[PDB]
Protein backbone atom coordinates (compact mmCIF):
# COMPACT_ATOMS: atom_id res chain seq x y z
CA UNK A 1 0.00 0.00 0.00
CA UNK A 2 2.06 2.94 -1.33
CA UNK A 3 -0.36 5.72 -2.28
CA UNK A 4 -2.54 4.75 0.73
CA UNK A 5 0.09 5.48 3.41
CA UNK A 6 1.28 8.89 2.16
CA UNK A 7 -0.43 11.99 0.79
CA UNK A 8 1.86 13.15 -2.02
CA UNK A 9 2.32 16.89 -2.41
CA UNK A 10 4.45 18.98 -4.77
CA UNK A 11 7.82 18.48 -6.41
CA UNK A 12 10.87 19.62 -4.45
CA UNK A 13 13.59 18.70 -6.96
CA UNK A 14 12.22 13.56 -8.69
CA UNK A 15 11.57 14.20 -4.99
CA UNK A 16 8.06 15.06 -3.74
CA UNK A 17 6.84 16.59 -0.53
CA UNK A 18 4.54 14.29 1.35
CA UNK A 19 2.90 13.64 4.69
CA UNK A 20 2.66 10.23 6.32
CA UNK A 21 -1.05 9.54 6.76
CA UNK A 22 -0.42 7.54 9.96
CA UNK A 23 0.71 10.58 11.98
CA UNK A 24 0.95 13.56 9.57
CA UNK A 25 4.77 13.32 9.67
CA UNK A 26 6.43 15.47 6.98
CA UNK A 27 8.28 13.21 4.55
CA UNK A 28 10.11 13.42 1.25
CA UNK A 29 9.17 10.90 -1.43
CA UNK A 30 12.08 10.18 -3.77
CA UNK A 31 11.57 8.21 -6.97
CA UNK A 32 14.49 6.49 -8.68
CA UNK A 33 14.20 4.90 -12.12
CA UNK A 34 15.60 1.36 -12.21
CA UNK A 35 16.97 1.78 -15.74
CA UNK A 36 19.17 4.65 -14.51
CA UNK A 37 20.84 3.04 -11.48
CA UNK A 38 24.65 2.80 -11.54
CA UNK A 39 25.59 0.60 -8.57
CA UNK A 40 23.33 -2.12 -7.17
CA UNK A 41 23.53 -3.78 -3.78
CA UNK A 42 21.82 -6.37 -1.58
CA UNK A 43 20.03 -5.96 1.74
CA UNK A 44 19.92 -8.73 4.36
CA UNK A 45 16.67 -10.07 2.86
CA UNK A 46 18.74 -10.99 -0.22
CA UNK A 47 16.73 -8.38 -2.08
CA UNK A 48 18.69 -6.62 -4.82
CA UNK A 49 18.28 -2.88 -4.16
CA UNK A 50 20.06 0.25 -5.38
CA UNK A 51 23.24 0.99 -3.44
CA UNK A 52 21.60 4.19 -2.20
CA UNK A 53 19.08 2.13 -0.21
CA UNK A 54 21.90 -0.02 1.20
CA UNK A 55 23.86 3.05 2.28
CA UNK A 56 20.82 4.84 3.70
CA UNK A 57 19.90 1.81 5.82
CA UNK A 58 23.47 1.57 7.14
CA UNK A 59 23.40 5.20 8.34
CA UNK A 60 19.72 5.20 9.42
CA UNK A 61 20.39 3.92 12.93
CA UNK A 62 19.33 6.42 15.57
CA UNK A 63 19.69 10.19 15.53
CA UNK A 64 22.19 11.93 13.27
CA UNK A 65 22.92 14.80 10.95
CA UNK A 66 22.04 12.36 8.16
CA UNK A 67 18.68 12.11 6.40
CA UNK A 68 16.77 9.08 7.66
CA UNK A 69 15.27 6.50 5.33
CA UNK A 70 11.89 5.71 6.88
CA UNK A 71 10.79 3.12 4.32
CA UNK A 72 11.08 2.15 0.66
CA UNK A 73 9.03 0.35 -1.99
CA UNK A 74 9.81 -1.39 -5.26
CA UNK A 75 7.69 -0.74 -8.37
CA UNK A 76 7.98 -2.19 -11.91
CA UNK A 77 10.44 0.43 -13.20
CA UNK A 78 11.45 2.37 -10.09
CA UNK A 79 12.23 2.35 -6.41
CA UNK A 80 10.51 4.83 -4.11
CA UNK A 81 12.32 6.09 -1.01
CA UNK A 82 10.50 7.61 1.97
CA UNK A 83 12.82 10.10 3.67
CA UNK A 84 12.28 12.40 6.60
CA UNK A 85 11.60 16.02 5.68
CA UNK A 86 12.59 18.81 8.07
CA UNK A 87 10.18 21.72 8.19
CA UNK A 88 10.89 24.50 7.84
CA UNK A 89 13.98 23.75 5.73
CA UNK A 90 16.39 25.33 3.24
CA UNK A 91 19.33 23.64 1.57
CA UNK A 92 22.74 25.15 2.23
CA UNK A 93 23.28 26.21 -1.42
CA UNK A 94 20.16 28.44 -1.50
CA UNK A 95 21.09 29.70 1.97
CA UNK A 96 24.53 30.85 0.83
CA UNK A 97 23.12 32.34 -2.37
CA UNK A 98 20.69 34.42 -0.31
CA UNK A 99 23.05 35.35 2.52
CA UNK A 100 26.43 35.72 0.85
CA UNK A 101 29.57 34.72 2.71
CA UNK A 102 28.66 33.35 6.15
CA UNK A 103 30.00 34.87 9.36
CA UNK A 104 32.76 32.58 10.62
CA UNK A 105 30.81 31.74 13.78
CA UNK A 106 27.96 30.36 11.67
CA UNK A 107 30.26 28.59 9.22
CA UNK A 108 32.02 26.95 12.20
CA UNK A 109 28.73 25.61 13.61
CA UNK A 110 27.60 24.40 10.16
CA UNK A 111 30.97 22.87 9.20
CA UNK A 112 31.25 21.19 12.60
CA UNK A 113 27.85 19.57 12.11
CA UNK A 114 28.83 18.40 8.62
CA UNK A 115 31.98 16.87 10.11
CA UNK A 116 29.95 14.99 12.74
CA UNK A 117 27.54 13.74 10.07
CA UNK A 118 30.35 12.56 7.78
CA UNK A 119 32.14 10.84 10.68
CA UNK A 120 28.84 9.12 11.36
CA UNK A 121 28.74 7.89 7.76
CA UNK A 122 32.28 6.56 8.01
CA UNK A 123 31.55 4.87 11.36
CA UNK A 124 28.68 3.06 9.62
CA UNK A 125 30.91 1.95 6.71
CA UNK A 126 29.49 4.51 4.24
CA UNK A 127 31.35 6.95 1.96
CA UNK A 128 29.06 9.73 0.73
CA UNK A 129 31.25 10.91 -2.21
CA UNK A 130 29.10 13.97 -2.92
CA UNK A 131 29.51 16.35 0.02
CA UNK A 132 28.49 19.85 -1.13
CA UNK A 133 26.17 22.66 -0.06
CA UNK A 134 23.40 21.39 -2.36
CA UNK A 135 23.38 18.11 -0.40
CA UNK A 136 23.01 19.75 3.02
CA UNK A 137 19.63 20.70 4.51
CA UNK A 138 19.26 23.27 7.29
CA UNK A 139 16.44 22.74 9.77
CA UNK A 140 15.84 26.45 10.29
CA UNK A 141 14.06 26.07 13.63
CA UNK A 142 16.41 23.58 15.30
CA UNK A 143 19.65 24.88 13.75
CA UNK A 144 20.56 21.30 12.73
CA UNK A 145 22.13 20.27 9.43
CA UNK A 146 21.20 17.10 7.54
CA UNK A 147 23.32 15.41 4.87
CA UNK A 148 21.25 14.14 1.93
CA UNK A 149 21.42 12.29 -1.39
CA UNK A 150 23.51 9.14 -1.08
CA UNK A 151 22.99 8.47 -4.83
CA UNK A 152 26.75 8.69 -5.48
CA UNK A 153 27.98 6.92 -2.34
CA UNK A 154 29.88 3.69 -1.84
CA UNK A 155 30.69 1.26 0.89
CA UNK A 156 33.68 2.72 2.72
CA UNK A 157 36.94 0.89 1.97
CA UNK A 158 40.64 1.50 2.50
CA UNK A 159 41.72 0.56 -1.03
CA UNK A 160 41.75 2.87 -4.04
CA UNK A 161 38.55 3.97 -5.75
CA UNK A 162 38.68 4.20 -9.55
CA UNK A 163 35.03 5.16 -10.15
CA UNK A 164 33.31 8.46 -9.34
CA UNK A 165 29.90 10.03 -10.05
CA UNK A 166 29.81 12.91 -7.57
CA UNK A 167 30.22 16.62 -8.25
CA UNK A 168 33.36 17.37 -10.23
CA UNK A 169 34.10 20.84 -8.79
CA UNK A 170 34.26 19.22 -5.31
CA UNK A 171 36.42 16.26 -6.48
CA UNK A 172 40.11 16.15 -5.57
CA UNK A 173 43.06 16.71 -7.91
CA UNK A 174 44.09 13.06 -7.79
CA UNK A 175 40.70 12.18 -9.30
CA UNK A 176 41.12 14.89 -11.95
CA UNK A 177 44.68 13.90 -12.93
CA UNK A 178 44.79 10.13 -12.34
CA UNK A 179 41.14 8.97 -12.02
CA UNK A 180 41.86 7.38 -8.64
CA UNK A 181 41.44 8.45 -5.00
CA UNK A 182 41.12 7.18 -1.45
CA UNK A 183 37.85 7.71 0.36
CA UNK A 184 38.73 9.72 3.44
CA UNK A 185 41.24 12.06 1.89
CA UNK A 186 38.86 12.68 -1.02
CA UNK A 187 36.09 13.48 1.46
CA UNK A 188 38.41 15.91 3.27
CA UNK A 189 39.13 17.73 -0.01
CA UNK A 190 35.41 18.19 -0.66
CA UNK A 191 35.04 19.49 2.91
CA UNK A 192 37.71 22.09 2.16
CA UNK A 193 35.76 23.17 -0.92
CA UNK A 194 32.64 23.28 1.26
CA UNK A 195 34.28 25.39 3.97
CA UNK A 196 35.65 27.92 1.45
CA UNK A 197 32.12 28.03 -0.02
CA UNK A 198 30.65 28.94 3.39
CA UNK A 199 33.11 31.69 4.29
CA UNK A 200 33.59 33.17 0.80
CA UNK A 201 30.06 32.77 -0.62
CA UNK A 202 30.97 30.42 -3.49
CA UNK A 203 33.24 27.47 -4.26
CA UNK A 204 36.86 28.41 -5.13
CA UNK A 205 37.35 26.31 -8.28
CA UNK A 206 35.29 25.88 -11.43
CA UNK A 207 37.80 24.36 -13.90
CA UNK A 208 40.11 21.34 -13.77
CA UNK A 209 43.18 23.58 -14.07
CA UNK A 210 42.22 25.47 -10.92
CA UNK A 211 41.52 22.19 -9.10
CA UNK A 212 44.91 20.67 -9.82
CA UNK A 213 46.65 24.06 -9.57
CA UNK A 214 46.68 24.11 -5.79
CA UNK A 215 46.27 27.86 -5.33
CA UNK A 216 43.56 29.28 -3.10
CA UNK A 217 42.73 32.96 -3.50
CA UNK A 218 40.45 34.42 -0.82
CA UNK A 219 37.79 36.72 -2.26
CA UNK A 220 36.38 37.63 1.16
CA UNK A 221 37.95 38.60 4.44
CA UNK A 222 38.70 35.31 6.20
CA UNK A 223 40.68 34.80 9.39
CA UNK A 224 44.20 33.39 9.14
CA UNK A 225 43.14 30.36 11.21
CA UNK A 226 40.24 29.58 8.88
CA UNK A 227 42.41 30.13 5.78
CA UNK A 228 44.95 27.72 7.24
CA UNK A 229 42.34 24.99 7.83
CA UNK A 230 40.95 25.44 4.31
CA UNK A 231 44.38 25.34 2.69
CA UNK A 232 45.22 22.25 4.73
CA UNK A 233 42.05 20.49 3.58
CA UNK A 234 42.98 21.41 -0.01
CA UNK A 235 46.54 20.11 0.09
CA UNK A 236 47.32 18.77 -3.38
CA UNK A 237 48.94 15.64 -2.01
CA UNK A 238 46.26 13.49 -0.30
CA UNK A 239 48.54 12.31 2.52
CA UNK A 240 49.17 16.00 3.40
CA UNK A 241 45.49 16.58 4.19
CA UNK A 242 44.22 16.56 7.79
CA UNK A 243 42.34 13.65 9.26
CA UNK A 244 38.85 14.33 10.56
CA UNK A 245 40.35 14.44 14.06
CA UNK A 246 42.92 17.07 13.01
CA UNK A 247 40.13 19.11 11.43
CA UNK A 248 38.06 19.05 14.61
CA UNK A 249 41.10 19.79 16.81
CA UNK A 250 42.08 22.70 14.56
CA UNK A 251 42.19 26.02 16.48
CA UNK A 252 39.56 27.52 14.16
CA UNK A 253 37.12 24.77 15.19
CA UNK A 254 37.10 25.50 18.93
CA UNK A 255 34.11 26.81 20.90
CA UNK A 256 31.46 25.80 18.38
CA UNK A 257 27.88 26.93 18.99
CA UNK A 258 25.24 24.38 19.90
CA UNK A 259 22.59 23.79 17.19
CA UNK A 260 19.85 25.63 19.12
CA UNK A 261 22.14 28.59 19.82
CA UNK A 262 22.98 28.58 16.11
CA UNK A 263 19.29 28.79 15.25
CA UNK A 264 18.55 31.53 17.78
CA UNK A 265 21.52 33.76 16.92
CA UNK A 266 21.64 33.20 13.18
CA UNK A 267 18.43 31.68 11.83
CA UNK A 268 15.45 33.04 13.85
Amino acid sequence: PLESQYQVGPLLGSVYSGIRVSDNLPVAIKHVEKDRISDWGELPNGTRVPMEVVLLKKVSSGFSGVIRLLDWFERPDSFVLILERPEPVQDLFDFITERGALQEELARSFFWQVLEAVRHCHNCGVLHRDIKDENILIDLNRGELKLIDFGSGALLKDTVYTDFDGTRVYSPPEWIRYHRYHGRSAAVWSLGILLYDMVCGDIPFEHDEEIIGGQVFFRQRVSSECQHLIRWCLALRPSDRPTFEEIQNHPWMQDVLLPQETAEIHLH
Binding site: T97, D130, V169
Partner: peptide, 7 residues
Protein backbone atom coordinates in the same frame (compact mmCIF):
# COMPACT_ATOMS: atom_id res chain seq x y z
CA UNK B 1 28.18 33.85 -11.31
CA UNK B 2 27.31 31.23 -8.67
CA UNK B 3 25.64 28.08 -9.90
CA UNK B 4 24.67 24.57 -8.90
CA UNK B 5 26.56 21.59 -10.33
CA UNK B 6 24.85 18.26 -11.11
CA UNK B 7 26.43 14.93 -10.24
Amino acid sequence: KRRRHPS
